[PDB]
Design a binder for this molecule. Structure first.
Ligand SMILES: [Mg+2]
Lengths: 243, 235, 241, 244, 250, 228, 240, 111, 231
């Protein structure tokens, strides 16, 4: 034994326990989701209000990469920030050499390879975040989810954090009851609902909802934060559904 | 085994805490600050009588306006002194002026936590840094291997420190003359020393605005020891 | 017990980290198979999309390394993509330096050498993947070369990889014991793919829909993967015989 | 991280010994015995090959005795591969000196440099020491004929007669008994062989289990010649000294 | 990252053993038997092509390798370690000899370079020893024919004939009986085949045996004519057919 | 060290009561060859700044890409990227001036002359110049290359000192700029008829006019000129 | 590069690697330094388990650092060669830049600095060596004798000993050396040095080496018979 | 060939009185025979009751002043808001200038 | 326990113990309070001496004219991080002629701290910081933890017994946020908040440290006689 004390060591069953322990930090984080829609993607996240002294609207968690990609994550927040900073460097260098903004699948592999690299040596620690990200490129909308192992796939909908089970089930319903498509504006409302429903598992504290989206028609393919009236509307839609 | 830069569960750096133990084994050094000057005194603690005691250099000049006394692993102090002298001289070259006593002390303390897997361990020596500058007058600092430095009106470091520090708590006041301070260092050294105090196994120094940092001759200290014997044999 | 944790010899001359990397190779619970035709090389792999929230078009363990070389991986996807990116970089560099396309067997050797280094150098862990490279080489013709975490590699008449590799292997051996030739004596790649799927069905004892398979085909001067609809057409022809 | 697997090859024990150096010396004590004897008119190097097979090609083999330059040779005891690394380094140092000063390197200077290299592996770098002990036989115009030894610690000393490898305690006692200052090379040859014959762990001593060499002034007029003995020549000297 | 294993992984134990080298030799003991025999007019090196699966094309896996036109090598132990050593050996024959002297190195010196590489893996930081023993056969003008063994430690020895791996102890005994200083190359090949049959379990034919010789110059393998002094490689790998021809008169 | 290959000529600008105007022709010269005719040399950054560039075009395209990357980077983790923490003309200029001086100090200059025109948060007009040497200066009127010799004299008749700015309207200023561009077309051998003009006003914002032409040209007197 | 912190503090505030370096010194052959009124003498023990030794060529225990300063040691022999080389280089470097040979104190301070540096540098172990550094400052006739140790502390001594059984010979010197009356002559000082060694040495054969250093670069090694005369003269005064 | 230097003209004048000091300079900036600006300030308040002007090549002059102002700021951080005396400022500027001894700031400085 | 030897090791529950031990050093530190209105932002800090002969350790550091912080924990780590902040504020001014937004300052500190939690050989920072500043979007207060977590707040406290002050501020939120244009009242409220963390000791003239920054107020520190007014 002692196989779990060092990163990059295979156990006798062929597992990297340090990566599996990184998942525990992710599972301990706040709930965050992504929904792929007809011409775009929607990202939403639960921000726990630790105290009244937190300035509302001011501790933003969702992060833009370039101008067309959104990223949200659950787990160790600084690890997520570090990953996004790398993502921004990768996006910058891609656009520098190739002119066009980085395609989403290309960007996904860039993060994937970087996260995977942190499972190859005992001199580094695996990332303590699962990252949901995506956006609009020249081949349409894309939504990805990336784990501490470096594993990622494309998704129709995705969820991570403490309320991932609840959110998954809710996402599975949307996929079944909308086999032809979901509109960007619908997805914003649905995102609000699913976070409110997933908040059951973090009920001790009340929370602040935060949504963003990239849509070819609604945002011109750029990533923007859902603010003001449209945000309040989605909050109302969500509040009516929990009663 | 375990990292050199590791924290304990109480939130302390093991290596720093262990170096503090090494300093408790060191010979006693005392400093007292007055409005007329700062006095620095040390216990030489020769390990054998064939050792020529005047080759024991535990009080050291850093510049004309700054002196320093040491306690602990005294070999570790040489590079700290070298750095301090360089910093003081360098500042004078860049700014055509004397460097503040605090700024010198801060420069020395920046070395402290430069260790890991840079040097391989913290310093095992504590310093009393005494000096004068125009802005803040006569000053005495206590520089530790943790990188923290405190200003003191009076301070004792080394093996007889808390016994001496309790004594300095009583005796120090804002109107102390330089001469009183000299006798007080001698008095308290005599109290905490193992062997009997004399001019060969203890050393005094001071720093005044007018004459700068001066180490006292064994003849001048002998006079002050005799004066101290007479004052105490008078009540 | 630290000879278990890094790649140094145990008292019986074994590298346990290499052995445990072989075990990681079957984590995905996927079986693959490669065979050679007259003019082509075919590789098929099981496709399993367990979650309904996944985009199944992005779920793949077959890679287009160069225009001529294809690679299928048996192992976790992060290590697979690590190997895929590297092989792509190597193949492109080879072409730049030496002025011709990197042969399948040469790339296999190169990746096998990289794998060997991880078994000798302590700071690098082995990759928990088995790489099967396929092409129609311009000198050697249809080619299958397979690499593992030990740094071992060899050419193949045909091969199989995964949890049920032995059943597929023995099934293939028995066919070649009959036919007495090195390949599938078939003109079109369509028929070689049909052979590949048929013999996997028999060996595994399972039936496949169009979404349960992944197919790669190597011909002279290009390697390509089949869409779900191209595979459906393959399945339909199999059923009607 | 990596600290966990570090043996720390360059640390003191609580008694003030270097573990790895001590253990390397233990390794060397199982190596074939090598003997060096210094006379007034030359030096003898004799060494026992470790247990031979009849299929080992002897006449083309070199395991013990190595030429560093025309005036200096070494006898090896320990890991042969480790010795070859150091030998090639020494050969290069000798040529660097000759290139710089246009004079052959003095024996001690060569010995000191090799010993300093060995020492470095015990103080820094975190690598294991070389598991090798040398006997240096050489000549220069300052001190004449010289014998030195160096071991994995990097300490070197001069000798009139010395052994390294297996059974040095027994061998040193026998040399201590029969060695005399006025001794000549042909007597020293006989002493070296007789000493190996008695200390050997083999049943008897034969030509196929020996390497032999001499450094003589025996060369037409004031100059020195090295002679690495052929197998037939070792067979002759064994007969001539009445051991077979 | 950065390789932070800058310390030795092979160290002396209290008894003076270098553990990792011993364990490397143990890995060689498990390895498939290979051997070499020196004749008056040539050298032969041979081994068993133990194929992992019958679907594997065993001709694509070369256990006997050309290092230079007049030098060849076979092994016992870990195949991948052998493969990279052959790559390094071929390169060092050029970088540290041919590009300097305009000719291929003599057998003993190439062996010396391979040995050095293997020694360094036994002392350098963050690496394990190579888990192979090599047999290197070759010819050069001034030394004639020669056969060397190289071990994990970096130690090398010249042999008249020897065997390494699985059944080496039995094979060495067999070779002691048959070897003499008057063997012609055909006699040595015949003995190599007889010796190798003992350690081989099942099929014993040209497709399961890999065998090469260092013999006469082959001008037909040179690839060009018109330079009398260039007469071609002495290393030749026997074909499957050539091996089977000699297995009848066996 | 290099030499400029494909180049752009004058950029001219001035302040008026509520903002700034800037203009530059659409030519990319290759020595005396008028190689490229559709080159935009005014690059707006956000909706409150316009950077006009003369000199080497390859270096202009590089600078163009730096400014485009500035906007991207400023929006990272910045909820007020389109409000209080948006890019100011003063920020953009100082960044360029830093780069230009750094490049000249490595003896590898960006072979350009640049004018940053814009309106600050508080409504103040911003107009400042920087070139390949890292030299900077401000004035009510600014012009590069030939414009410095021919346009400034004309623009300075309208705004001669700071106190003339409140008295100058956007229509008088624009008319002065357009007249100057005609004069440069008459007299600069590396100029073109086609040009772009941009106005940044503190009330009406950024107006960007493309495909303008020099018009009302006086050539008729040429017919009477005979011989030398 | 190899970086491990080998010299580190223990919970009781001790650096074990430096303390274990002192144990290596304790095991080394005995060395003693005694300074007279116009000379310094350096005496050294040679362990007598080795005969068949060639003393012509064998490394001598006292080493000249410059023409006016010498260095002897106790501890690891190979380690001492590194300090001696560094000291010799620094001595020539000092002459080259300052245009004056090193003072004995400066040279001591240098060697002591090297030793200290090896107690808080990564990837190195301390020197298992203590030294006695002796000589005369240029244009000065006052004798100098300093000691260094693995920790890097150094100091001046009227007389001092290091190595095995140094406690015994320090006992001797502590009651046989008068500060008021330093050994007034070469003969007198050499005798006191030889006596102190005879407390511990075994045979007075070629087991004792002696080196005398006088002012103005006058250094000479005494040979067997010359020392033998001192040994003879001492036992003839003992039986009484 | 690229010339990294230029001449922006201008003239400056510093006079020291009994209990005061003046530092004057014209506000004209030029290249060759053209006027760049009729009001480009050349004399600056650098804090701590110190005024400075670096005349000649304006890019170097701006860089130097900008560096010195920065030096005042860091003097305060590092030395407990101590006021930087004019003599200490002079010595500090010497080191800024000599740091580019082999690629000089092409300016004549007065404080 | 087996997983606390270095920062590069997760525990089986996904915790980083070296980071948590660094957090523990803050809890031992002397209390410091931060709070803001819409016009001003205030830091109040209880300074801790070694004994009666010693000076009181300074807790508040100026970063720029419009920004500064207070510390609790390892003071040398605060010196490293505050020095880094000074440089970043400085870079923003020299290169972009732009005052560094307090939020960006938070993001830069987070990223600097994070790198020391993911690599071998390093250690986490052992200090917590309260950063106040007035920029283009008004007054701000940030709380930095050496885990890398930075949080924007109306008010807070860190160090030993900070919980008392943190509850007081949570009650008074609606009142103190409105104290616009009256600096003295905002300080009074901060001094009243920090008083809820006192036991045994009370606020004296060499004990108390106050700093303020706002609309037309550069970041300035009040010590000694200058805080007599507020005791
Ligand atoms: Mg490894």
């Amino acid at each position: 034994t002692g196989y779990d004390l060092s990163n990059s060591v295979f156990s006798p069953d062929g597992r990297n326990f340090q990566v599996e322990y990184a998942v525990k930090a992710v599972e301990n984080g706040t709930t965050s989701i992504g929904i792929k829609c007809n011409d775009g993607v929607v990202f939403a996240v639960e921000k726990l209000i630790t105290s009244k002294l937190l300035v509302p609207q001011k501790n933003v968690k969702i992060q833009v990469v370039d101008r067309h990609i959104g990223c949200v994550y659950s787990g160790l927040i600084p690890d997520g920030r570090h990953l996004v900073n790398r993502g921004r460097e990768e996006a910058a260098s891609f656009k520098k050499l190739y002119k066009t903004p980085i395609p989403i699948p290309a960007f996904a592999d860039r993060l994937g390879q970087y996260v995977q690299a942190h499972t190859l040596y005992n001199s580094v620690r695996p990332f303590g975040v699962s990252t949901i990200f995506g956006g609009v490129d020249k081949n349409g909308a894309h939504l990805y989810m990336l784990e501490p192992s470096g594993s990622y796939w494309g998704y129709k909908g995705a969820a991570t954090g403490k309320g991932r089970q609840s959110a998954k089930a809710e996402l599975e319903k949307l996929v079944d009851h909308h086999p032809e498509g979901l509109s960007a504006r619908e997805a914003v409302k649905q995102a609000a609902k699913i976070i409110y429903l997933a908040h059951e598992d973090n009920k001790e504290k009340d929370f602040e909802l935060e949504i963003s989206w990239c849509s070819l028609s609604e945002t011109n393919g750029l990533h923007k934060f859902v603010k003001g009236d449209l945000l309040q509307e989605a909050i109302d839609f969500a509040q009516k559904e929990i009663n | 085994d375990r990292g050199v830069s590791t924290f304990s569960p109480e939130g302390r750096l093991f290596q720093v805490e262990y170096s503090l133990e090494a300093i408790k084994l060191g010979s006693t050094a005392i400093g007292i600050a007055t409005k007329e000057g700062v006095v620095l005194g040390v216990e030489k603690r020769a390990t054998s009588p064939l050792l020529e005691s005047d080759s024991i250099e535990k009080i050291v000049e850093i510049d004309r306006h700054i002196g320093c006394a040491m306690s602990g692993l005294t070999a570790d102090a040489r590079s700290m002194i070298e750095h301090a002298r360089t910093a003081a001289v360098t500042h004078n070259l860049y700014y055509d002026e004397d460097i503040n006593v605090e700024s010198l002390t801060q420069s020395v303390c920046d070395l402290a936590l430069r260790f890991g897997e840079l040097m391989s361990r913290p310093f095992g020596v504590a310093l009393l840094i005494a000096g004068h500058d125009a802005d803040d007058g006569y000053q005495l600092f206590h520089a530790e291997p943790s990188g923290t430095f405190y200003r003191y009106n009076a301070k004792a470091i080394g093996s007889g420190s808390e016994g001496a520090q309790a004594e300095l708590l009583n005796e120090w006041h804002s109107s102390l003359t330089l001469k009183e301070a000299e006798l007080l260092v001698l008095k308290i050294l005599k109290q905490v020393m193992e062997e009997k105090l004399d001019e060969n196994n203890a050393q005094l120094s001071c720093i005044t605005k007018q004459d700068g940092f001066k180490i006292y001759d064994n003849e001048k200290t002998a006079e002050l020891i005799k004066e101290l014997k007479e004052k105490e044999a008078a009540e | 017990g630290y000879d278990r944790h890094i790649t140094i010899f145990s008292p019986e001359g074994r590298l346990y980290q290499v052995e445990y990397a072989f075990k990681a190779t079957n984590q995905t619970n996927i079986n693959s198979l490669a065979v050679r035709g007259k003019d082509c090389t075919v590789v098929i792999s099981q496709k399993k999309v367990p979650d309904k929230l996944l985009d199944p078009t992005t779920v793949s363990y077959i890679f287009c390394i160069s225009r001529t070389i294809g690679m299928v991986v048996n192992g976790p996807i992060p290590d697979a993509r690590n190997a895929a990116l590297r092989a792509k970089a190597e193949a492109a560099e080879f072409r730049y330096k030496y002025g011709y396309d990197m042969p399948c067997d040469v790339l296999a050797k190169r990746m096998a050498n990289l794998s060997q280094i991880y078994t000798q150098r302590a700071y690098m862990r082995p990759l928990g993947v088995i790489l099967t490279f396929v092409s129609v080489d311009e000198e050697l013709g249809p080619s299958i070369y397979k690499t593992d975490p030990a740094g071992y590699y060899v050419g193949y008449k045909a091969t199989a990889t995964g949890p049920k590799q032995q059943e597929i292997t023995t099934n293939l051996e028995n066919h070649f014991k009959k036919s007495k030739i090195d390949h599938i004596n078939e003109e079109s790649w369509e028929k070689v793919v049909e052979f590949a799927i048929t013999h996997m069905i028999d060996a595994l004892g399972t039936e496949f829909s169009k979404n349960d398979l992944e197919v790669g085909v190597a011909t002279k001067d290009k390697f390509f993967t089949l869409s779900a609809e191209n595979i459906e057409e393959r399945l339909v022809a199999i059923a009607e015989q | 991280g990596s600290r966990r697997y570090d043996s720390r090859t360059t640390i003191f024990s609580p008694e003030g010994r270097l573990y790895q150096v001590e253990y390397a010396l233990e390794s060397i004590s199982h190596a074939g015995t090598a003997i060096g004897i210094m006379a007034s008119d030359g030096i003898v190097l004799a060494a026992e090959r470790k247990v031979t097979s009849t299929l080992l090609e002897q006449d083309t083999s070199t395991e013990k005795l190595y030429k560093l330059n025309d005036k200096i040779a070494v006898a090896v005891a320990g890991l042969t591969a480790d010795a070859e690394i150091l030998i090639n380094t020494a050969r290069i140092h000798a040529q660097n000196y000759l290139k710089t000063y246009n004079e052959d390197i003095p024996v001690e200077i060569l010995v000191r440099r090799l010993s300093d290299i060995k020492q470095g592996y015990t103080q820094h770098g975190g690598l294991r020491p070389f598991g090798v002990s040398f006997i240096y036989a050489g000549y220069d115009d300052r001190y004449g004929y010289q014998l030195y030894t160096s071991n994995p610690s990097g300490n070197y000393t001069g000798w009139k007669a010395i052994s390294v490898g297996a059974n040095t305690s027994a061998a040193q006692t026998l040399l201590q008994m029969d060695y005399k200052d006025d001794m000549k090379v042909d007597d020293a040859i006989e002493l070296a062989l007789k000493t190996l014959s008695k200390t050997t762990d083999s049943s008897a001593l034969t030509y196929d289990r020996l390497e032999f060499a001499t450094i003589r002034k025996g060369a037409n007029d004031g100059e020195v010649y090295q002679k690495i003995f052929k197998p037939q020549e070792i067979k002759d000297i064994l007969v001539k000294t009445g051991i077979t | 990252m950065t390789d932070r294993y800058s310390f030795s992984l092979t160290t002396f134990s209290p008894s003076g053993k270098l553990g990792q080298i011993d364990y490397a030799l143990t890995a060689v003991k498990q390895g498939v038997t290979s051997l070499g025999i020196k004749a008056t007019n040539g050298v032969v090196i041979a081994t068993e092509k133990k194929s992992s699966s019958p679907l594997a094309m065993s001709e694509t896996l070369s256990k006997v390798s050309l290092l230079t036109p007049d030098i060849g090598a076979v092994y016992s132990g870990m195949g991948p370690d052998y493969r990279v050593l052959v790559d390094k050996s071929r390169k060092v024959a050029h970088t540290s000899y041919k590009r300097i002297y305009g000719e291929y190195p003599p057998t003993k010196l190439l062996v010396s370079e391979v040995a050095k590489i293997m020694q360094e893996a036994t002392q350098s930081g963050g690496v394990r020893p190579f888990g192979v023993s090599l047999l290197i056969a070759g010819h050069d003008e001034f030394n004639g024919f020669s056969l060397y063994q190289v071990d994990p430690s970096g130690s090398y020895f010249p042999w008249k004939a020897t065997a390494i791996g699985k059944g080496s102890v039995a094979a060495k005994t067999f070779l002691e009986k048959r070897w003499n200083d008057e063997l012609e190359l055909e006699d040595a090949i015949h003995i190599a085949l007889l010796t190798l049959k003992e350690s081989v379990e099942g099929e014993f034919n040209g497709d399961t045996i890999e065998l090469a010789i260092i013999g006469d110059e082959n001008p037909d393998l040179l690839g060009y004519t018109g330079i009398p002094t260039d007469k071609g490689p002495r290393f030749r790998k026997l074909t499957s057919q050539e091996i089977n021809d000699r297995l009848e008169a066996l | 060290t290099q030499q400029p290959i494909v180049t752009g000529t004058s950029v001219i600008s001035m302040k008026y009561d509520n903002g700034v105007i800037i203009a530059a022709d659409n030519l990319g010269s290759y020595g005396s060859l008028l190689r490229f005719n559709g080159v935009e040399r005014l690059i707006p950054v956000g909706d409150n700044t316009v950077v006009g560039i003369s000199g080497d075009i390859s270096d202009m395209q590089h600078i163009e890409r730096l400014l485009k990357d500035l906007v991207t980077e400023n929006a990272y983790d910045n909820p007020l990227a389109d409000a209080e923490e948006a890019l100011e003309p003063s920020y953009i200029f100082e960044y360029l001036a830093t780069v230009m001086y750094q490049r000249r100090s490595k003896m590898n200059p960006l072979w350009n002359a640049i004018i940053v025109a814009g309106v600050q948060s508080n409504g103040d007009q911003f107009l400042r110049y920087v070139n390949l040497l890292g030299v900077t200066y401000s004035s009510p009127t600014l012009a590069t290359g030939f414009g410095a010799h021919m346009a400034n004299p004309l623009l300075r008749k309208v705004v001669d000192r700071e106190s003339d700015i409140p008295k100058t309207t956007v229509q008088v200023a624009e008319e002065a700029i357009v007249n100057a561009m005609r004069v440069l077309y008459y007299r600069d051998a590396r100029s073109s008829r086609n040009f772009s003009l941009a106005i940044i006003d503190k009330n009406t914002g950024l107006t960007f006019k493309k495909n303008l032409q020099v018009e009302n040209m006086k050539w008729d007197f040429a017919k009477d000129i005979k011989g030398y | 590069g190899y970086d491990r912190a080998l010299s580190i503090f223990s919970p009781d505030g001790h650096i074990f690697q430096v303390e274990y370096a002192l144990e290596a010194v304790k095991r080394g052959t005995c060395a003693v330094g005694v300074k007279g009124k116009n000379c310094v003498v350096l005496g050294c023990e040679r362990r007598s388990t080795l005969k068949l030794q060639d003393t012509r060529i064998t490394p001598s225990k006292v080493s000249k650092i410059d023409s006016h300063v010498v260095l002897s040691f106790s501890g690891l022999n190979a380690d001492s060669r590194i300090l001696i080389e560094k000291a010799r280089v620094e001595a020539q470097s000092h002459r080259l830049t300052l245009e004056d040979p090193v003072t004995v104190e400066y040279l001591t301070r240098y060697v002591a600095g090297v030793q200290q540096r090896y107690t808080q540098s990564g990837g190195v172990r301390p020197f298992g060596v203590s030294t006695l550094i002796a000589g005369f400052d240029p244009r000065d006739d006052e004798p100098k004798l300093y000691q260094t140790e693995p920790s890097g502390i150094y100091s001046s001594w009227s007389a001092q000993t290091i190595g095995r059984n140094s406690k015994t010979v320090r006992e001797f010197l502590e009651k046989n050396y008068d500060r008021k009356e330093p050994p007034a002559t070469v003969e007198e000082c050499v005798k006191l040095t030889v006596r102190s060694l005879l407390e511990v040495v075994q045979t007075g054969a070629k087991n004792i080496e002696i080196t005398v250093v006088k002012p103005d670069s006058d250094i000479v090694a005494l040979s067997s018979e010359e020392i033998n005369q001192y040994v003879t003269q001492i036992e003839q005064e003992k039986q009484e | 060939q690229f010339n990294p230097y230029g001449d922006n003209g201008g003239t400056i004048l510093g006079i020291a009185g009994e209990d005061f000091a003046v530092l004057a300079g014209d506000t004209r900036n030029i290249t060759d025979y053209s006027i760049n600006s009729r009001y480009e300030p050349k004399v600056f308040d650098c804090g701590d009751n110190i005024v400075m002007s670096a005349n000649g090549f304006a890019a170097d002059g701006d860089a130097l002043v900008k560096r010195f102002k920065n030096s005042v700021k860091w003097y305060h951080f590092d030395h407990n808001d101590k006021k930087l005396s004019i003599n200490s400022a002079a010595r500090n500027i010497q080191h800024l200038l000599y740091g580019k001894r082999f690629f000089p700031y092409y300016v004549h400085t007065i404080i | 326990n087996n997983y606390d030897g270095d920062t590069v090791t997760f525990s089986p529950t996904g915790r980083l113990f070296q980071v948590e031990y660094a957090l523990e050093a803050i809890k031992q530190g002397s209390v410091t309070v931060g709070l803001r209105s819409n016009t001003h932002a205030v830091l109040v800090a209880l300074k801790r001496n070694a004994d009666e002969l010693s000076s009181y350790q300074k807790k508040i550091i100026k970063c720029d004219e419009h920004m500064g912080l207070s510390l609790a924990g390892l003071a040398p780590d605060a010196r490293v991080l505050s020095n880094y902040l000074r440089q970043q504020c400085n870079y923003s001014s020299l290169v972009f002629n732009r005052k560094l937004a307090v939020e960006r300052a938070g993001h830069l500190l987070c990223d600097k701290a994070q790198k020391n939690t993911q690599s071998y050989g390093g250690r986490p920072y052992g200090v917590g910081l309260l950063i106040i500043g007035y920029d283009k979007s008004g007054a701000h207060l940030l709380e930095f933890q050496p885990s890398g977590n930075v949080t924007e707040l109306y008010g807070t406290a860190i160090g030993a017994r900070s919980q008392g002050a943190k509850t007081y501020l949570e009650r008074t939120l609606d009142t103190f946020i409105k104290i616009d244009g009256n600096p003295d009242e905002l300080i009074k409220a901060g001094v009243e908040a920090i008083s809820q963390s006192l036991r045994d000791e009370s606020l004296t003239v060499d004990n108390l440290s106050i700093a303020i920054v706002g609309k037309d107020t550069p970041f300035t520190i009040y010590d000694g006689e200058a805080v007599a007014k507020y005791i």
